[PDB]
Write the structure tokens for this entry.
Amino acid sequence: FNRQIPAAASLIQTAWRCYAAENPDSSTWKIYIRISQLREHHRATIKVIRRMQYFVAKKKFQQAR
Amino acid sequence: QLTEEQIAEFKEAFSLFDKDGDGTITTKELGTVMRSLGQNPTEAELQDMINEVDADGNGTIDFPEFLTMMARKMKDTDSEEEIREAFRVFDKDGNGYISAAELRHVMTNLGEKLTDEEVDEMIREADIDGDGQVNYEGFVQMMT
Ligand SMILES: [Ca+2]
Ligand SMILES: [Ca+2]
């Protein structure tokens, strides 16, 4: 019943995680518990992946419309 | 639009995925990076991500594609309208506002499931008046 609900939330969530990652002291950087000390090469690949996941969540929201 | 330094920063980011050095990014290389961050993607997850960036459609990502994706103005490229309609799925019947408690429920328990600390940042920055009612139209602009 309404597939738009998950796709909508995921588009908001990915868009915000993409926006929050531009702030390097954001709480969004705490979610990687498996990384001992977060270095700059982690942050560079994290921003790329988050952008990729935003474009996917955007597509799936589009498809559910 | 783009500086010479941002392009160089994107070239270094491209090199971290392109472990082989052949100038393209495969689904297997993306899966290696993501697992190094504690993620556990599946082959469809990785192929979904690659298909959104692969222009030609060969299944691989070259640096022009990578740079095109990283430089997409995801603020004016008709994105604000879709995030707005995403909020409208849960909108308080037409309102244009969303309960801070309702936003926390959707952000924490649905979709990607953000952390409780992440929702605090989102609510605090989006609750301009501090009343527990966020207008997302204004929040969308802040993100963009
Ligand atoms: Ca490669
Ligand atoms: Ca390609």
